[PDB]
Amino acid sequence: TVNVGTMADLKAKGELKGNTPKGPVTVVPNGNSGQISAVNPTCTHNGCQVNWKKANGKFVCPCHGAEFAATGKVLKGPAIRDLPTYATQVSGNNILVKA
């Protein structure tokens, strides 16, 4: 597992990025009760790294505009596959990304 920071950090920063054995990870809130979502930000269209835009509640790809929900669900093309995701575990405020 990869410790990407605390729930307090996620709150203050809006997101937490990390590097895992299976690729990059960006952790964002996925609700208001502590739910979080860890996605591999590699756009499923042409591999650009997507950018979490909290004001719109979506990841937006800077290369061709694909958009994804906090869960990684594709919301707008040209990507047609959801972002890969990672299971997470919060252990005493620490956000742990698995795999």
Sites of contact with a copy of itself (CB under 8 A) = 63-65, 77-78
How far, in Å, CA of 23 to CA of 98, rounded? 11
Q: Give the residue with the Cβ less far from ligand FES, 7 or 69.
A: 69
Neighbours of 5 (CB within 10 A): 17
Based on the shown chain and the rule CB under 6 A, indicate whether residue 48 belongs to the binding site for ligand FES. Answer: yes
Based on the shown chain and the rule CB under 6 A, indicate whether residue 84 belongs to the binding site for ligand FES. Answer: no
Q: Give the residue with the Cβ less far from a copy of itself, 34 or 77.
A: 77
Q: Which helix (H) or strand (E) holds 10?
A: helix 7-13
Q: Least CB distance from residue 42 to ligand FES, whole Å?
A: 9
If we measure between CA atoms, which residue out of 67, 64, 99, 62 comes closest to residue 82?
A: 67
Neighbours of 12 (CB within 10 A): 9
Asked if residue 58 lies in contact with residue 40, where contact means CB atoms within 8 angstroms, the answer is: no
Based on the shown chain and the rule CB under 6 A, indicate whether residue 79 belongs to the binding site for ligand FES. Answer: yes
Q: Which of residues 8-47 bind ligand FES (CB under 6 A)?
A: 43, 45-47
User: Which chain residues interact with ligand FES by CB under 6 A?
Assistant: 43, 45-48, 61, 63-66, 78-79
